[PDB]
Design an enzyme around this catalytic site. Structure first.
Site, PDB file in Angstrom:
ATOM      1  N   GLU A  23      -2.811  -1.917  23.114  1.00  0.00           N
ATOM      2  CA  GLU A  23      -3.246  -3.353  22.977  1.00  0.00           C
ATOM      3  C   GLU A  23      -2.249  -4.278  22.493  1.00  0.00           C
ATOM      4  O   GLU A  23      -1.512  -3.945  21.508  1.00  0.00           O
ATOM      5  CB  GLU A  23      -4.544  -3.493  22.141  1.00  0.00           C
ATOM      6  CG  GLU A  23      -4.215  -3.164  20.468  1.00  0.00           C
ATOM      7  CD  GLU A  23      -5.495  -2.724  19.768  1.00  0.00           C
ATOM      8  OE1 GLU A  23      -6.358  -3.721  20.030  1.00  0.00           O
ATOM      9  OE2 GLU A  23      -5.453  -1.692  19.110  1.00  0.00           O
ATOM     10  N   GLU A  70      16.551  19.437   2.923  1.00  0.00           N
ATOM     11  CA  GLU A  70      16.121  19.999   1.649  1.00  0.00           C
ATOM     12  C   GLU A  70      14.765  20.147   1.554  1.00  0.00           C
ATOM     13  O   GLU A  70      14.275  20.974   0.675  1.00  0.00           O
ATOM     14  CB  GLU A  70      17.004  19.665   0.248  1.00  0.00           C
ATOM     15  CG  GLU A  70      18.633  19.801   0.678  1.00  0.00           C
ATOM     16  CD  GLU A  70      19.311  18.954  -0.276  1.00  0.00           C
ATOM     17  OE1 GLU A  70      20.239  19.563  -1.133  1.00  0.00           O
ATOM     18  OE2 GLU A  70      19.121  17.798  -0.721  1.00  0.00           O
ATOM     19  N   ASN A 122      -7.804   6.526   2.870  1.00  0.00           N
ATOM     20  CA  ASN A 122      -8.142   5.398   2.364  1.00  0.00           C
ATOM     21  C   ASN A 122      -9.036   5.268   1.106  1.00  0.00           C
ATOM     22  O   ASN A 122      -9.037   4.417   0.145  1.00  0.00           O
ATOM     23  CB  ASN A 122      -8.805   4.507   3.458  1.00  0.00           C
ATOM     24  CG  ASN A 122      -7.602   4.213   4.580  1.00  0.00           C
ATOM     25  OD1 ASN A 122      -6.520   4.353   4.149  1.00  0.00           O
ATOM     26  ND2 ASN A 122      -8.219   3.779   5.604  1.00  0.00           N
TER      27      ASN A 122
HETATM   28  N1  LIG Z   1      -4.217   2.071   5.376  1.00  0.00           N
HETATM   29  C1  LIG Z   1      -4.726   1.529   6.685  1.00  0.00           C
HETATM   30  N2  LIG Z   1      -5.817   1.967   7.193  1.00  0.00           N
HETATM   31  C2  LIG Z   1      -5.925   1.588   8.343  1.00  0.00           C
HETATM   32  C3  LIG Z   1      -5.456   0.268   8.973  1.00  0.00           C
HETATM   33  N3  LIG Z   1      -5.861  -0.010  10.221  1.00  0.00           N
HETATM   34  C4  LIG Z   1      -6.859   1.019  10.763  1.00  0.00           C
HETATM   35  N4  LIG Z   1      -6.849   1.968   9.679  1.00  0.00           N
HETATM   36  C5  LIG Z   1      -7.681   2.992   9.559  1.00  0.00           C
HETATM   37  O1  LIG Z   1      -7.499   3.793  10.651  1.00  0.00           O
HETATM   38  C6  LIG Z   1      -8.715   4.500  11.440  1.00  0.00           C
HETATM   39  C7  LIG Z   1      -8.524   3.512  12.739  1.00  0.00           C
HETATM   40  O2  LIG Z   1      -7.541   3.982  13.428  1.00  0.00           O
HETATM   41  P1  LIG Z   1      -6.773   2.885  14.437  1.00  0.00           P
HETATM   42  O3  LIG Z   1      -5.572   2.557  14.010  1.00  0.00           O
HETATM   43  O4  LIG Z   1      -7.627   1.613  14.310  1.00  0.00           O
HETATM   44  O5  LIG Z   1      -6.855   3.630  15.965  1.00  0.00           O
HETATM   45  P2  LIG Z   1      -5.855   3.002  16.945  1.00  0.00           P
HETATM   46  O6  LIG Z   1      -4.602   3.593  16.788  1.00  0.00           O
HETATM   47  O7  LIG Z   1      -5.950   1.578  17.115  1.00  0.00           O
HETATM   48  O8  LIG Z   1      -6.449   3.435  18.439  1.00  0.00           O
HETATM   49  P3  LIG Z   1      -7.263   2.799  19.396  1.00  0.00           P
HETATM   50  O9  LIG Z   1      -8.400   2.119  18.794  1.00  0.00           O
HETATM   51  O10 LIG Z   1      -7.520   3.314  20.778  1.00  0.00           O
HETATM   52  O11 LIG Z   1      -6.404   1.539  19.645  1.00  0.00           O
HETATM   53  C8  LIG Z   1      -9.580   3.945  10.458  1.00  0.00           C
HETATM   54  O12 LIG Z   1     -10.004   4.763   9.523  1.00  0.00           O
HETATM   55  C9  LIG Z   1      -9.165   2.804   9.689  1.00  0.00           C
HETATM   56  O13 LIG Z   1      -9.777   2.593   8.612  1.00  0.00           O
HETATM   57  C10 LIG Z   1      -4.152  -0.229   8.226  1.00  0.00           C
HETATM   58  O14 LIG Z   1      -3.865  -1.275   8.480  1.00  0.00           O
HETATM   59  N5  LIG Z   1      -4.096   0.328   6.828  1.00  0.00           N
HETATM   60 MG   LIG Z   2      -6.275  -0.116  18.485  1.00  0.00          MG
END
Ligand SMILES: Nc1nc2c(ncn2[C@@H]2O[C@H](COP(=O)(O)OP(=O)(O)OP(=O)(O)O)[C@@H](O)[C@H]2O)c(=O)[nH]1
Ligand SMILES: [Mg+2]
Ligand SMILES: Nc1nc2c(ncn2[C@@H]2O[C@H](COP(=O)(O)OP(=O)(O)OP(=O)(O)O)[C@@H](O)[C@H]2O)c(=O)[nH]1
Ligand SMILES: Nc1nc2c(ncn2[C@@H]2O[C@H](COP(=O)(O)OP(=O)(O)O)[C@@H](O)[C@H]2O)c(=O)[nH]1
Ligand SMILES: [Mg+2]
Lengths: 430, 442, 52, 48, 442
Positions: E70, E253, E205
């Site tokens: 995206e 290491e 998280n």
């Molecule tokens: N710590 C942290 N967790 C995140 C963040 N963004 C999303 N998450 C977590 O990661 C998971 C969602 O994964 P995404 O990264 O949204 O999935 P994606 O890589 O975008 O995959 P697509 O939806 O197909 O585009 C959930 O558990 C969210 O809470 C972030 O910016 N920081």
């Molecule tokens: Mg996404």
């Protein structure tokens, strides 16, 4: 530690209106809802009774229920009425008809789900919930029937909290309604099972307070509701201000009730004294104690001189020494020893609070558990037995749907309550 | 060197405020945890170390935790004058009180809060190199003080083991009273306290009221006066760790000298030159006068008469300008008296201590300034009379199961009342047996 | 309807006096009730030195 | 040491005096506030 | 002396924003890629080279690629403040997301984008002279992170071969959850990560929320706080390459010391002085307190309790003013503890590192400024409990084929679910066997 209030029927809504005036005055909240107080001590416990509305404003944690909107329109038109949340006013479209069965069974079941919905929405918003506080009369129609219905539902839903009721019992001399004994008996049956602590106030004792102590020439219901509002706002004071010896509603219950059926209490408030005399005598703990135990100052027809104290509690507001409190309570117990229950080694609990009510140097509120309570129930039971033997007005209630066995059960349960008080009055070591 | 203070409930926290006010003013720590005067090389001092630790910026912070189940008292500490002295983690508060129920504190509510307290005590004990005991302040009349004090002492006793635990405890006065259920809570407290404390010092508010009316000139006393007196007593007992002196006394020496048998560890406390400023400049206050004073029943902080018992051991603390020869002459004069009696198995009845630091004067205080003072803690069989009146009030109330349904609903069954009452009866019999004269030498 | 920017600014000005906004802000540590000074090297004791 | 004790007693007396003065001023303050409240309430009731 | 960063999907790009903010602010590079005139005077230094390369005109540009299906997050980078820092070719964006489908990322859509990514990484890797590993940031809960991360790691692993690949991976927390299909994607991801990663760091998280509530005083955290904590951890691990120190630790290491058997490469991470400004001024922060802190489960960034397992290896990185003798004394004290247990085949359980550069403070940040910090990554059998819970949720859904038609429609055989579930079951049995308390001599 926040309380949720429910006000039911005409008497309950009017006393509640005066109560929320008194409490808003003590914390310096304008009738617009803006904080205007003058010490941080006022703000730091405002959460106990108020919820926060947008830009500055505070809203009072109360539910108003009535079967005809006349009272609701009167309270909304009052000087503080605007503070109340509009969605919290619940009313029907036809009256209780002074009939307990109508109020309990026909319009009760129609409205009751919406009152529980409002109480639950308000309760689940609290971070930690303390007991409920309910105001109603036992002699009325919607007050008695819907109040006891609601008490039962809240006791089912919140059995681990405190359940508190303030109730204005029917008077022996001047009735406003013919069928008062039935409604009173059925309501006392409901209360003794459901309630944790119930306070009972006559209208005759408040009139005698007004005439003898305050020497009022022409008292009005505003004065009666102010007397009630003073004690009601006083019992919770230790919840919401600092002090040398903190106390709590649960701590009051644990110290006052020896056995679970004996939970009906009398109320009084001490520094009542006319404006002409006040210039000649300053307030002090001996003076407060003397007024506090004078039967002239008790708001129940029964007089302490006909019974014995099981337990009593005094909550003091003001800056005072603890030694004076302890020694006053010892001297009163020793000098009047026949009126104090001999098996409990010390009958009086004391508590001390730093912040007095505005314009008084000191005040005390008195709560008493006295076996003279039997007289009030006895008078009603007698009037019930005279009416019930002759089927005097029963067809109205049976036409609403009541079984006669309910009436015989309620009579038997009230008679057993009277017997239990009488038995504990006459107990002995042997 | 180090000692850790644990404050429980309302009486213990309020007495703690007076204690830390005094210890700050004696060392010179400002209310914000600072130090006036110079800090350069040339002089160097360590006496604070018993009660305070310093940060790398030179701020001082004290070795205490404040524990309560209701917020109000700790929030008063948080918003008061000493806000900057305490670390915020040390001030621990629950949501709701134990409502005068020992059972509610022990079973229902304290079980959630107890692990934070143990984590704080662990973090304190790790920042020490010669910890030599715990000081605990509580009242046994209330619910959280009894229930959580017992539970915490049990856990502390398992985790730390041999380390000593000294309690300062306020018992319900014999006719002044504050709540109806005090006897039940005091019996149940004493059952746990018997097993898990090394020395217990007993206080009654009625005695401190009598002492403040007769000796001080205060007509209308309040709790701040009592708390300042208690603070003076604790400061006198702990002064031996902190300042130079002729005859020092380490906390293990108290337990070795005062306790003859492992159950006989309850001691009476009194303090001599309680005197007002106007009287103090009309009179000298020599050693022999104050030594004669500490044995008069008008000086005691517990409502008991020692003429109804026998002394087993006495510990006499002298602080200020005193010379050992005057202490010896005083003790020999006391020993001569006919109304003072020691058990015949304790021939060498006295222990002495002599410290050079005179007692501190607090700006708002009511005690006079004096060059010397003496404080006594003593073990005597008369204490058995104090327990007997609580047991009599318990027997009267328990005959009808007067309040028991609250305790049974919150989790304590019914047998535990009878168990505790039998244990206190056995403690009474122990004090009867130890005080019985030996029938013969053969 | 929004009464523009001045009303909104005063509305947010009247909000922070709430206790909830003070002790529970969004994505921030609640503010201190007294002044603190951060040393040049940071918080904590400096390591003690010894002779070579 | 005689003079040293004398001057220490003097400074202690001065500190006690200033503390007592602050306490008395606060007492007078709250007393006059309470009196004003009582007076205004009485006036209101008489007018009614 | 060099490392290349690959950021995938939403979590990986947002954590990348915090990381590159930190690395810029720590070295002193401005947001427009320049460096002020006073940082480049008097001395000539190379430490930036691990993360930045300079052009012949002296602009700095960072060694990273950003991959997403995206546009929105990369378009936020393109239009934001750091627009001029990144090379525009490095920021690669597709047309449409993988819609929480592993199959869409891996089979259908990522197959179009992957060759551009490989061409950018190749063009970067050819302009290097001491590349020493790949750092990969992704989440295994979403579709593009799982599918494209696996496909890209497979291609990278064939083309570059033996070079090390270290992953920081956000796994689904044990009761907070954001999407329904997380178990399927996490199982299928983990199947690919087993073959093609050298060390995998696990994050939840829910643990960082607990840590931000408990240590810091933040009631309402948002992703920027978590991402700043992760950035601090990554800076701690990579500091050993970039600054002077007593005991350096090269990225090879870590792999040599932490991995006992080739499948046992999943590690827990924790960080010690997460503290607010008001607590920081109440406490000293010596080496032994932070060493004791890193072993408490309240300090961990993954929701697991290490008391339910045995440690195999720990690697402790100290940065700031620390001297090796206190590290040795601390590790010996930890080793003394009874609630910390090592497998009996690993007697020498610890690796240490000591670096002189203290942690940097970010203007909007919530951490205090501190003179020293320690970061730990450790291998422990407790991690097996996380997989067992993922397998239970997979078994619940897969018994009825709850969502499978999406995966089968986008190109996947139903058989691949059973294969992955059997491989993760074998991983559970590996952690059971490797953790055996003892073997019999007969
Ligand atoms: N710590 C942290 N967790 C995140 C963040 N963004 C999303 N998450 C977590 O990661 C998971 C969602 O994964 P995404 O990264 O949204 O999935 P994606 O890589 O975008 O995959 P697509 O939806 O197909 O585009 C959930 O558990 C969210 O809470 C972030 O910016 N920081
Ligand atoms: Mg996404
Ligand atoms: N000396 C002294 N005694 C106190 C003080 N406050 C209460 N007491 C006494 O302690 C007993 C009451 O115990 P509390 O401390 O109130 O009980 P608690 O610890 O608060 O337990 P909870 O009621 O459950 O909160 C009575 O005998 C009081 O006279 C005080 O401030 N100083
Ligand atoms: N103290 C007090 N009593 C009231 C008030 N209004 C009505 N009463 C009494 O309550 C009884 C009538 O009950 P009511 O409130 O009309 O019952 P309802 O019809 O169910 O609301 C009578 O004894 C009245 O004297 C009031 O404002 N204050
Ligand atoms: Mg309390």
């Amino acid at each position: 530690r926040e309380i949720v209030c429910v006000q039911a029927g005409q008497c309950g809504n009017q006393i509640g209106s005066k109560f929320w005036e008194v409490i808003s005055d003590e914390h310096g909240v304008d009738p617009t809802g803006t904080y205007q107080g003058d010490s941080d001590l006022q703000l730091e416990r405002i959460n106990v009774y108020f919820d926060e509305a947008t830009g500055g404003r505070y809203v009072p944690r109360s539910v108003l229920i009535d079967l005809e909107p006349g009272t609701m329109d009167s309270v909304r038109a009052g000087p503080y009425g605007q503070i109340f949340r509009p969605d919290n006013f619940i009313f029907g479209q036809s009256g209780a008809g002074n009939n307990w069965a109508k109020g309990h069974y026909t319009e009760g079941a129609e409205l009751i789900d919406s009152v529980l919905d409002v109480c639950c929405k308000e309760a689940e918003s609290c971070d930690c919930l303390q007991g409920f506080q309910i105001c109603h009369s036992l002699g009325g129609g919607t007050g008695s029937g819907m109040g006891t219905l609601l008490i039962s539902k809240l006791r089912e839903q919140y059995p681990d909290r405190i359940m508190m009721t303030f109730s204005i019992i029917p008077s022996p001399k001047v009735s406003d309604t013919v069928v008062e004994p039935y409604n009173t008996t059925l309501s006392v049956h409901q209360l003794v099972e459901n309630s944790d602590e119930s306070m009972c106030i006559d209208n005759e004792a408040l009139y005698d307070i007004c005439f003898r102590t305050l020497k009022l020439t022409t008292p009005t219901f505003g004065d009666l509701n102010h007397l009630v509002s003073a004690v009601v706002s006083g019992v919770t004071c230790c919840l919401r201000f600092p002090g040398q010896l903190n106390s709590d509603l649960r701590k009051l219950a644990v110290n006052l009730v020896p056995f679970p059926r004996l939970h009906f209490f009398m109320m009084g408030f001490a520094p009542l004294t006319s404006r002409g005399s006040q210039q000649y005598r300053g307030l002090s703990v001996p003076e407060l104690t003397q007024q506090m135990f004078d039967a002239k100052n008790m708001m129940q027809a029964a007089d302490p001189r006909h019974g014995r104290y099981l337990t009593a509690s005094a909550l003091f507001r003001g800056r005072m020494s603890t030694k004076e409190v302890d020694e006053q309570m010892l001297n009163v117990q020793n000098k009047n020893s026949s009126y104090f229950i001999e098996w409990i080694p010390n009958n009086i609990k004391s508590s001390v609070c730093d912040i007095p009510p505005k314009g008084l140097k000191m005040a005390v509120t008195f709560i008493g558990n006295n076996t003279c309570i039997q007289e009030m129930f006895r008078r009603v039971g007698e009037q019930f037995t005279l009416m019930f033997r002759r089927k005097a007005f029963l067809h109205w209630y049976t036409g609403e749907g009541m079984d006669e066995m309910e009436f015989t059960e309620a009579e038997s349960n009230m008679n057993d309550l009277v017997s239990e008080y009488q038995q504990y009055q006459d107990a002995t070591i042997e | 060197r180090e000692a850790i203070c644990i404050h429980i409930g309302q009486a213990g926290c309020q007495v703690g405020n007076a204690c830390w006010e005094l210890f700050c003013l004696e060392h010179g720590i400002q209310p914000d945890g600072a130090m006036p005067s110079d800090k350069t090389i040339g002089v160097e001092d360590d006496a604070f170390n018993t009660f305070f630790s310093e940060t790398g910026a030179g701020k001082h912070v004290p070795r205490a935790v404040f524990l309560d189940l209701e917020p109000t008292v700790v929030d008063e500490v948080r918003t008061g004058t000493y806000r900057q002295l305490f670390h915020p983690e040390q001030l621990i508060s629950g949501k709701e009180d134990a409502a005068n129920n020992y059972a509610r504190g022990h079973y229902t509510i304290g079980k959630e809060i107890v692990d934070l307290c143990l984590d704080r005590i662990r973090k304190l004990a790790d920042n020490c190199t010669g910890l030599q005991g715990f000081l605990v302040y509580h009242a046994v009349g209330g619910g959280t003080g009894s229930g959580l004090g017992a539970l915490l002492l049990e856990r502390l006793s398992v985790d730390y083991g041999k380390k000593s635990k000294l309690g300062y405890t306020v018992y319900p006065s014999p006719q002044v009273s504050t709540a109806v259920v005090e006897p039940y809570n005091s019996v149940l407290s004493t059952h746990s306290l018997l097993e898990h404390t090394d020395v217990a010092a007993m206080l009654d508010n009625e005695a401190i009221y009598d002492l403040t009316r007769r000796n001080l000139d205060i007509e209308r006393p309040t709790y701040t006066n009592l708390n300042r007196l208690i603070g003076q007593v604790v400061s006198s007992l702990t002064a031996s760790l902190r300042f130079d002196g002729a005859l020092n006394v380490d906390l293990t020496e108290f337990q070795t000298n005062l306790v003859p048998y492992p159950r006989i560890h309850f001691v009476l406390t009194s303090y001599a030159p309680v005197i007002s400023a106007e009287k103090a400049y009309h009179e000298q206050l020599s050693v022999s006068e104050i030594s004669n004073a500490v044995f008069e029943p008008a000086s005691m902080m517990t409502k008991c008469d020692p003429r109804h018992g026998k002394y087993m051991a006495c510990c006499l603390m002298y602080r200020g300008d005193v010379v050992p020869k005057d202490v010896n002459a005083a003790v020999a004069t006391i020993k001569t008296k006919r109304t003072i009696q020691f058990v015949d198995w304790s021939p060498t009845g006295f222990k002495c201590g002599i410290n050079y630091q005179p007692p501190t004067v607090v700006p708002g205080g009511d005690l006079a300034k004096v060059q010397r003072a003496v404080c006594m803690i003593a073990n005597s069989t008369a204490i058995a009379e104090v327990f007997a009146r609580i047991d009599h009030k318990f027997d009267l109330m328990y005959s009808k199961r007067a309040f028991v349904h609250w305790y049974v609903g919150e989790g304590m069954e019914e047998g535990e009342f009878s168990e505790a009452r039998e244990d206190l009866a056995a403690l009474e019999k122990d004090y009867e047996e130890v005080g019985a004269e030996s029938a013969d030498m053969d | 309807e929004t009464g523009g920017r001045m009303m909104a600014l005063m509305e947010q000005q009247l909000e922070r006096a709430y206790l909830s906004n003070v002790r529970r802000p969004l994505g921030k540590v609640p503010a201190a009730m007294y002044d603190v000074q951060v040393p040049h090297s940071g918080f904590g004791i400096p390591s003690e030195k010894s002779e070579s | 040491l005689r003079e040293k004790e004398a001057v220490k007693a003097r400074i202690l007396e001065e500190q006690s005096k200033k503390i007592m003065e602050e306490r008395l001023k606060r007492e007078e303050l709250e007393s006059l506030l309470s009196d004003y409240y009582e007076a205004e309430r009485i006036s209101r009731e008489r007018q009614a």
